[PDB]
Design a protein around this ligand. Structure first.
Ligand SMILES: CC(=O)N[C@H]1[C@H]([C@H](O)[C@H](O)CO)O[C@@](O[C@@H]2[C@@H](O)[C@H](O)O[C@H](CO)[C@@H]2O)(C(=O)O)C[C@@H]1O
Ligand SMILES: CC(=O)N[C@H]1[C@H]([C@H](O)[C@H](O)CO)O[C@@](O[C@@H]2[C@@H](O)[C@H](O)O[C@H](CO)[C@@H]2O)(C(=O)O)C[C@@H]1O
Ligand SMILES: *[C@@H]1O[C@H](CO)[C@@H](O[C@@H]2O[C@H](CO)[C@@H](O)[C@H](O)[C@H]2NC(C)=O)[C@H](O)[C@H]1NC(C)=O
Ligand SMILES: CC(=O)N[C@H]1[C@H]([C@H](O)[C@H](O)CO)O[C@@](O)(C(=O)O)C[C@@H]1O
Ligand SMILES: *[C@@H]1O[C@H](CO)[C@@H](O)[C@H](O)[C@H]1NC(C)=O
Ligand SMILES: *[C@@H]1O[C@H](CO)[C@@H](O)[C@H](O)[C@H]1NC(C)=O
Ligand SMILES: [Ca+2]
Lengths: 172, 310, 172, 309, 172, 310
């Protein structure tokens, strides 16, 4: 993908995450857990809701009948109606196919970008206490219990508290 | 030790088209082209008039089938298949142009022409074709003019309508083209027949020619403050009233059952199209405020990320 | 946004910066300063000028009247023209809505990316002499005077001149 | 020490629409739909013609109201409301087609038909419906042909025009439909009336009807081709034919003219001077115009997201 | 461009690399080498192939004649046909100009994205054994022979094997 | 030790337009607008008919130039410039409506009308204007009816044809308009001439004028079951066979030569258009399944990355 996370360095999605769109999975001495990220999920959903509100519409123009259903009409002008209606129908089919293809591309890449922005936000707050494994995870170089894991998820992790343990662990 | 990031997924996804991939799998997707249709003409909040087997032209001339629709107002006007316009066989000149005007109108009102004929003339010629009230009859807004005496020829006559209104008035008339010369001599005599119609914006002569016979209709528009003169001597089917089309309204041509308990803005032959979606797969010929017709079975719009299942 | 800089990890814009779109704010022993980046500002403006040059355009097709203003047209031809014109107006209204909507989406995300590209250019230039604070700033672990700050902006900051000092202060 | 990267912002940003958000705030924006119009016809750099009282068709047949507009050249032709085509009662067959054809031209010139009639025909038939210079008159480019002695039979006569020019010529004639048989007989005699018009391109027969009116008919005559009129009372014969020259823009508007302003787009209400791609004044426009749209405003972002302090 | 690599931090392309779109150029004790990356090359090609399949097409709609080539037609209905055809042409000309411009912009930025996704993938492989020089290259802080270089390209590089040698050289 | 990432480049790149840039150099691009066509009609896999010198109306009345095209089936009918419809001076009323109707069809078949005339009526009238096989002849599908003795009055005769093929038949007749009165008196006598055509659908009257001669043609559709009655006393050019248009076909109007050694689905005045490209700037007037016309010399679609050389 464009931002290279979903179908990218993250190998696959999690079918066991029903409570959100993006989220975290941890591993410490206390055990293993899962938790959805609310802001990034809703950022993606609110963007898709906006697409639907714009696309799911019709025109308020009143069109009257120019072709008769139960009788014949002049051959010369009836051909002109047929040419015109076919030409207009080609345009609307082309615009419909183009609209949907373009939006689908943007939706897929937008969703990928929201995954990347959460990964980068975690990267920067972890600072020098963690390293990237290349699969969407961060190998943390200090004893991070379930309270420390929640501070990462909620953006209240202070790196300088754990820095000295991490710098020692990483260098040897 | 480790904290990982990830996204949701499903087992059974759905395929959508993108710019770069015709088979791209996503977690969820919704339709943009409507496939289904309601076959009930939804007419809630609409002052409508279902004609039944009455043709739109029939209510101007006054067919027996169009007895409940001579005068009225509406915003919608429904037309049906095989609706009878003419009880007596024949056809109007410039028929399709006339039908459009009536279907686009939002009402019809009648005005008396005020024609009266001499002692020789009989303006009450009934027929076996047009029958109302269990007996022989004729077009309600027209009068078949014939001689009262069977041998005697039809007298030279002149009738003149005057539009006293501020709007243009629609005036129709028929011409009897007899089947046999024995029949022509019985009704209008041996004399040579000649019908002249004359106004400020219309001039035309109508010479008759030779199981039953036929009556071909003609029509024109009498402008405000103008007069239209019918000079004749046998054959003319003169009007007793004229028509005035009121306002504007939606002319629907369909065959579906009517329904007053639901509302709608788009209509076609098979029914009414109620949907919030932008595109539509049912028919290129629709009326009202409609979704756009497209040559596509389905166009799925992605409402979720790429599906990358385990 | 898509690239996560504008309305992303950078908390807000600067109304004080009037001489550019993107720029720097430094803090050192000497004091405080602010300077705008020309190249990234001009990259964003040039791209937006290009859009305006493309969109602010009329077709040179010479159209003629097909409906009389002061006269009654034939009723059959007039209904067709009314159907055609209204179908054409629905297409152009739809195109104009989608054009502007699509282009506004691009303009925003384009400007988002020019910020990020400047941010990345600085990150790689500072190398191991600095660390990201997670809100669009770089904490520099050596004495960086106004000439040193100048050299970062001008893209002439040599990392190896301060590398020995910086690693000692980073490890500590 | 610290170095912080950031972007500009403004106090008062503008709302724009994106694909994903209807109420998106940006630092600057610009309008794409033109909503205002000059209530004027902008005729700078245009050799124009204001017909005023004259209707385009009246230039060909030659109504008194069109005496100043029988001949000329132009790149723009302006027609007004309640313009006079006919002084005497009647109309033209394929009227709108003929009107549009004149409103595309860049001029009209006239050529003499040279038609001559015998001593028993009065070629100078006038009327009180068509007034000019005090006394009774008739269409300047036509001639009302009647019998010189009242009641006498109009003689069988033949007139043929040849196109000696290298461009096509437009020829018009009228067929008088009298009020009564008394009138028919007094002007054209007791005989039956046939008028035949024929060429390589065109062929038609006309039979007068019997209140009074002169209905008009017309056709084109190609270079070198002959058009022949065979008649015996009823024909309103042309004394001149018309050649439509080049091309020009036809405008139908009541708005006044301004020669200091220039424009390439026009409508009933006036002119549309705008570099903008779209427009919401009228779908009925002429010339090189912005495309009409059903929208009051569409704002194009010319700047990033506005995220103020 | 959007992703800041092609015509960005990578100064220019390689005319020498004919066997692929993206690739590697290394330098070690042994000498130099060059190799194309199949994965990223084919991702860019397949996406461009996809565009051509959708764009290089026509509608299957049958259009019959309405303007006669040899005989003439009424001047009024002739102008109605001329107005309708010019209106439809202006739409298709606009839609064609828009399509291509939109797609070209997407193709250029997509190709830029595949370049960055390769760069980021290699950065995460190398982990703490190398540093970014700012111009698209990684300075690897241990003797990396052709087989070590091959494993970086093949995605089989284990950072643990060279970590202790690397951190000693980096810190000095 | 150093490993560098990079992209390919080319010496000569092509310029394309993007949303932000009119002059954007890329590694490769491909054209989307076709500006060249074959100067030939590509008719492979098409049961086609090239009319050549024959005009479509002439194939219904049987002009000598159309002898090879009186009957046939096709999916493509090719009309040419300056094609002959009439061997004898005249023209058809509602001409262009008929030509369109024939060019829209996918074949033609004749049905013999059958009706005969009296011994005093000569139905084998010919002319030097309409040559066939050396000697004089006439429109193959019609009969010129004149009096057998010069000066004798043409009998009042009534011809009638019924439709019994479960499909509408196209019927054509002609009306002679004599040059002088002596000519009119030689063929049809001194009597006043009057031709009446009458069916359920059609009804009209025709009268010869007097002013070498000409024959105007008229036409209408006879519905299945319905009859059409011709009553006349001189001047009628009556049909021998009526016509039946079969199905649907692609009408082409072109000057370009035929080629049966290649296929195409799009045609214009100057030839065929065989491109796979979506757009085209050859002509707005095209027929069949075509690329859409645009006012553009070239639109380059980029098939490669931005080109950053040396
Ligand atoms: C060429 C010619 O005969 N001109 C007449 C003209 C026409 O004959 C008439 O308009 C055809 O309908 O009629 C003119 O005026 C006439 C009066 O002189 C007469 O008293 O009453 C007539 C009506 O029955 C008619 O109005 C005219 O229109 O000026 C005289 C003109 O020379
Ligand atoms: C059916 C018939 O009468 N055919 C005649 C034909 C017609 O009378 C004529 O086309 C009607 O206008 O005329 C033909 O040739 C004639 C000569 O034989 C005659 O000497 O001179 C005539 C002109 O004054 C005329 O040209 C013809 O067209 O071939 C003879 C044909 O039998
Ligand atoms: C419709 O447009 C066509 C051209 O696009 C017009 O036909 C041209 O007319 C001019 C006369 O000014 C000729 O010189 C050209 O040779 C014609 N071109 C073609 C291709 O036929 C046509 O006149 C227009 N229709 C109307 C009613 O004005
Ligand atoms: C007014 C009049 O005379 N009406 C009679 C007509 C006409 O004579 C013919 O329709 C003329 O063609 O004939 C009828 O059999 C009919 O068909 O209804 C009876 C009817 O009483
Ligand atoms: C117009 O299209 C309809 C539906 O395909 C067809 O039935 C009809 O014959 C066409 N009209 C003309 C005049 O060819
Ligand atoms: C076409 O639309 C105009 C403006 O809405 C209206 O005045 C006119 O009546 C319409 N024409 C016909 C023939 O209905
Ligand atoms: Ca024109």
């Amino acid at each position: 993908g464009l931002f290279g996370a979903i179908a990218g360095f993250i190998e696959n999605g999690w079918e066991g995450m029903v409570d959100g769109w993006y989220g975290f999975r941890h591993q410490n001495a206390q055990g293993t857990g899962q938790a959805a990220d609310y802001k990034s999920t809703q950022a993606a959903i609110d963007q898709i809701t906006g697409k639907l509100n714009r696309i799911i519409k019709k025109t308020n123009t009143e069109f009257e009948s120019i072709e008769s259903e139960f009788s014949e009409i002049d051959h010369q002008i009836g051909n002109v109606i047929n040419w015109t209606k076919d030409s207009i129908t080609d345009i609307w089919t082309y615009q419909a196919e183009l609209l949907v293809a373009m939006e689908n591309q943007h939706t897929i890449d937008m969703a990928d970008s929201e995954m990347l922005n959460l990964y980068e936000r975690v990267r920067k707050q972890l600072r020098q206490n963690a390293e990237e494994d290349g699969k969407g995870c961060f190998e943390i170089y200090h004893a991070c219990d379930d309270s420390c894991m929640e501070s990462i998820r909620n953006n209240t992790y202070d790196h300088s508290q754990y820095r000295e343990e991490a710098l020692l662990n990483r260098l040897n | 030790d480790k904290i990982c990031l990830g996204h949701h997924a499903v087992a059974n996804g759905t395929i959508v088209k993108t710019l770069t991939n015709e088979q791209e799998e996503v977690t969820n997707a919704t339709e943009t082209v409507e496939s289904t249709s309601l076959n009930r003409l939804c007419m809630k909040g609409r002052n409508h008039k279902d004609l039944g087997n009455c043709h739109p032209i029939g209510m101007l001339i006054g067919t027996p089938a169009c007895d409940l629709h001579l005068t009225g107002t509406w915003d919608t006007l429904i037309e049906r298949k095989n609706a009878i316009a003419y009880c007596y066989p024949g056809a109007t000149v410039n028929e399709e142009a006339l039908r459009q005007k009536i279907m686009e109108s939002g009402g019809i009102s009648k005005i008396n022409t005020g024609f009266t004929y001499g002692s020789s003339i009989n303006s009450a010629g009934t027929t076996k074709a047009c029958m109302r009230n269990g007996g022989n009859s004729f077009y309600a807004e027209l009068k078949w003019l014939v001689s009262k005496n069977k041998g005697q020829n039809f007298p030279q006559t002149t009738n003149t309508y005057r539009n006293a209104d501020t709007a243009e008035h629609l005036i129709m008339w028929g011409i009897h083209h007899p089947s046999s010369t024995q029949e022509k001599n019985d009704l209008y005599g041996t004399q040579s027949l000649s019908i002249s119609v004359g106004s400020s914006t219309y001039k035309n002569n109508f010479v008759p020619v030779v199981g039953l016979s036929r009556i071909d209709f003609h029509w024109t528009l009498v402008q405000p403050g103008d007069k239209i003169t019918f000079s004749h001597n046998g054959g003319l089917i003169a009007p007793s009233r004229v028509s005035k089309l009121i306002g504007r309204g939606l002319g629907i041509q369909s065959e579906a059952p009517i329904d007053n308990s639901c509302e709608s803005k788009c209509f076609w032959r098979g029914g009414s199209i109620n949907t919030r979606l932008p595109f539509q797969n049912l028919s290129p010929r629709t009326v009202g405020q409609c979704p756009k017709y497209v040559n596509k079975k389905s166009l799925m719009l992605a409402t979720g990320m790429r599906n990358v299942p385990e």
